Design a protein around this ligand. Sequence first.
Ligand SMILES: [Cl-]
Ligand SMILES: [Cl-]
Ligand SMILES: [Cl-]
Ligand SMILES: [Mg+2]
Ligand SMILES: [Mg+2]
Ligand SMILES: [Mg+2]
Lengths: 162, 162, 161
Amino acid sequence: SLPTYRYPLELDTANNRVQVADRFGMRTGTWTGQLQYQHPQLSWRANVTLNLMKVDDWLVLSFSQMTTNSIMADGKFVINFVSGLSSGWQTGDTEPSSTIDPLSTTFAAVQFLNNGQRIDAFRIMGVSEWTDGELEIKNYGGTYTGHTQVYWAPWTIMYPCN
Amino acid sequence: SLPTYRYPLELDTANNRVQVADRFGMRTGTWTGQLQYQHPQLSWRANVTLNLMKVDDWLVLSFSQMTTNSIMADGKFVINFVSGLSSGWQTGDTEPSSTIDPLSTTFAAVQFLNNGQRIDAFRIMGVSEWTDGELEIKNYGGTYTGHTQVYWAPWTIMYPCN
Amino acid sequence: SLPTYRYPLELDTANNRVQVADRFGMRTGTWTGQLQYQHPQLSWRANVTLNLMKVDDWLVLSFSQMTTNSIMADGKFVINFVSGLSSGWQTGDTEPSSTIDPLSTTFAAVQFLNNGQRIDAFRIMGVSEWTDGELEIKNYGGTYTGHTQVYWAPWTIMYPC
Ligand SMILES: [Cl-]
Ligand SMILES: [Cl-]
Ligand SMILES: [Cl-]
Ligand SMILES: [Mg+2]
Ligand SMILES: [Mg+2]
Ligand SMILES: [Mg+2]
């Protein structure tokens, strides 16, 4: 008896052809919410919109340029996927497929604004944890100087998500 | 009636076995051309050879070490895939599978040369656009100093390409 | 006559359903051994544990924070997968699927310790070669200062495997 096929595999009945679904290589969405920065001496919330892309067994988060308040030498960022996901996306779709820490690391290019001067620097960001829809991205450090505001260039980060 | 299979799925007729093609996990090539740097105050073309690799639904570009003329604080790099691709590759094979911007970001390690002195720095590069075979990689910034020449360490960048 | 299926494809006989194996999207392991640093003027070995993850046709190496001896402006790191792999993993499972150099590059955030002072900097790391179980990660450079010790923040690197 002929088998059925489980996603990403699918049967195209018009041509009687088994294939990998086109959505598997690319599924887009957006998340609109508040990016939370957390540190014992400083915490804030900034309104952001991220582009999302599921590519095979990976989830890619794409940040456009942003201006945020000042940050400490290290700290953590939290994205709450409980609300804000575009249609077709469920909170569970952002859950990592492993509990290894870090799952992924990337660098974000920033300018620290101090007085009137812009100081180019970097921030190392690690996907560290997911708990009931809340994704934790730890900022371990990077180059630092005293500042009043942060200009973040665009950046992407991805993690295994199946 | 028995179905047919669409790439990356294939039927190995010798053993009557359905499998994912071996080329899906790795398909190599090269691109030989001129890397274009663009900025309103400074533009140039540098002869380069890139190694390419299609890994699942991703395209990886691999740059070897290079020496280029000086650059501005920000600007853009253009790779014209209209010509220069090795055999088996078509221009269309480099097209991203989404219009999200940035699709991907990476850091390139550089040394800025300022008459004898080598100044270590970084450049953030973002895959930004593809138009009729021309790939645009924006350089948002990074650390900077006045210089006459740039020594680029090797780097890779990848983007969803299905 | 009905075909058979080669991994990652599999037939779930209970439901007569063809699927991609769940392990294909994620297979974990660990490697315990000595990370080797090599340079003509300075060489050392440091005891480390890495987390590994096979994700589709990629292998991800995940480093936790570490403190190592000093390093030169450039040099190379060698991970010997001949021993130390957790159960279910063979040395051959870490072999890259191409000889292109670099296969992948990433940045590691560090602090260079110069007797009391911590200097934030970066290191560019490239997956460069694999020879009989020995993976070579070249450190092309990055920002640098004279130092006595290195504090490395956690980092991941991956390559087609
Ligand atoms: Cl859900
Ligand atoms: Cl074409
Ligand atoms: Cl083996
Ligand atoms: Mg402030
Ligand atoms: Mg010049
Ligand atoms: Mg020492």
